[PDB]
Amino acid sequence: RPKLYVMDNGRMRMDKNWMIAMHNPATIHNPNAQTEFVEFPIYTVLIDHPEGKILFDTSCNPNSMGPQGRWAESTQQMFPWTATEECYLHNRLEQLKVRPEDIRYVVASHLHLNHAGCLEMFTNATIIVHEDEFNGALQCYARNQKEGAYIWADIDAWIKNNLQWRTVKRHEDNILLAEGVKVLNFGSGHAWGMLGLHVELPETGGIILASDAIYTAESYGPPIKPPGIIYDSLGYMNTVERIRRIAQETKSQVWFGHDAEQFKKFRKSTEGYYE
Amino acid sequence: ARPKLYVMDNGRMRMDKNWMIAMHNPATIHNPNAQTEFVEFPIYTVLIDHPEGKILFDTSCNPNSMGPQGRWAESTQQMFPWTATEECYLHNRLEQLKVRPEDIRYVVASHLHLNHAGCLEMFTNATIIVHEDEFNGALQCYARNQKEGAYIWADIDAWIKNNLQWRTVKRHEDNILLAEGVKVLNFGSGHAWGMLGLHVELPETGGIILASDAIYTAESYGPPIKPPGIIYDSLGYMNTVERIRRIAQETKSQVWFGHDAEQFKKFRKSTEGYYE
Ligand SMILES: [Co+2]
Ligand SMILES: [Co+2]
């Protein structure tokens, strides 16, 4: 009988237009419309499963922010991450008496700065990632792109730590990872290659981890309100509607990438778990 | 074999620059409340007076678009205000060239947005060439009684009532040779559901590509490409821009953007002359 933990990995801020495109459009009466700098949670999920511990997303690297940080100053200033040491992934796991080395599977929803930050920790895991996302991030690396949402220093470490990669092929079916745990191949949308998770918990029932395939309940609607951070608009719309169908058909909850209200309600790792 | 191409000034529009250039000015830690700008841009149409028959690219906005009594919804008028003196109305521009709507053989609708398809209803004697996916999407807006957005219900109503003669460009259809040196380019989905361009080969001026809203401005075009906020198919949009770039390179054509203010300034308008 698995136990699922929600781990609080701090907070990030950014232009609300990244989150919800064209939220406050200029008008003839408000020609100089202003945006907001909204705050949202970064979190990860540990599924402690008989067949092996599964980790979904990894938040940000502890060495991300500041003048000796891995993130470019441009990135630090557009997407600032605020976190106490207790929020650091290694510490959240430590609190749960789980060692990095105990993780069998890490599912990378995508390789953005606030999701792939600590991949490098898990040298004993199989890292599951969409092949298109992997290819895209590696090109950023090879092209020496030191700005944007893909952190050169993070990728550098993934390679140096000799991580064990399992790429989900573009046209690959869902992957049964363990009893009641399936990796969903969302494909291109928010990013080059998005992965989700369906978890069937004996008590709680069905859970869909959407990650950045759906930022918030506002994104979800209906109607859908798409983000400014977006690669494949058609694929993004398709993915959201596909999630809506799966949720309906499997009677699952949809856990968004960073819904403040929803995260608030979650039972965090410090208080307990889901079963 | 020896045409005259005219650029017709059909007024100005204003809108949030974020529509034009996606996330042009993002907020940061030390500028959290970054503000946008209401940017003005030209609306124009192109008449190709060709021996085989007159060809019109785009139709601007309907004369009865703006105002309390206007066809455009309030919310639309506020976000996308059109300002035009009577001189700017397409029917007047054509008149000052001694061209009647009835003389137009073909209208090419780049797409069916408010500032491109506003005067389709005038050309009851023409074949209206439009992308089938754009036509389908617009008709759905109509049938769904959608009153707000960039597809004007009252305009579509008029197209149907005036019994326009339609020639849809199929999704996988090759370019169309409308006339000697005039090809309809099938750009497919991107900015909108179905985009059409034009390649014109003029004896003197050489090659011209009318991109319309496939490329808003030189800023859009880059490199680097800066996509718009008004977008349907991001991947298709990017594909189309790069395709236009290649065609321009290989055919040595100028690229005429949808609404580039600087380029528009440089144009010889219909009050001054034409391109041969
Ligand atoms: Co992301
Ligand atoms: Co348009």
Author numbering:
A (entry chain A): 9 to 283
B (entry chain C): 8 to 283
Q: What text does the study give?
A:
Asp122 is also conserved and is involved in coordinating the metal cation. To investigate the importance of these residues, we therefore substituted Tyr223 with phenylalanine and Asp122 with asparagine in GcL, eliminating their role in acid catalysis, and kinetically characterized the resulting GcL variants. The alterations in GcL activity may still suggest that this residue is important, but the interpretation of this effect is complicated by the clear role of this residue in metal coordination. This could be seen through crystallization, where multiple conformations were captured: one where both metals are present at high occupancy, exhibiting an active site configuration very similar to that of the wild-type enzyme; and a second form where the active site shows no bound β-metal (or bound with very low occupancy). In the case of the Asp122Asn variant, the Asp mechanism is no longer accessible due to the mutation of Asp122, leaving only the terminal hydroxide or concerted mechanisms as potential options. Curiously, in this variant, the activation free energy for the terminal hydroxide mechanism increases substantially, leaving the concerted mechanism as the only energetically plausible pathway with calculated activation free energies within 3 kcal mol–1 of the experimental data. Visual examination of our EVB trajectories indicates that during our simulations, the substituted N122 side chain interacts with and stabilizes the terminal hydroxide ion at the Michaelis complex, contributing to higher calculated activation free energies through reactant state stabilization.
MLLs degrade N-acyl-L-homoserine lactones (AHLs), molecules that are used in a microbial communication system called quorum sensing (QS) to coordinate a variety of behaviors, including virulence and biofilm formation. We provide the structural and biochemical analysis of the lactonase GcL (WP_017434252.1), isolated from the thermophilic bacteria Parageobacillus caldoxylosilyticus. GcL is a thermostable, highly proficient lactonase with broad substrate specificity (kcat/KM values range between 104 to 106 M–1 s–1) for substrates such as N-butyryl (C4) L-homoserine lactone (HSL) and N-decanoyl (C10)-HSL. The binuclear center, common to all MLLs, is coordinated by five histidine residues and two aspartic acid residues.
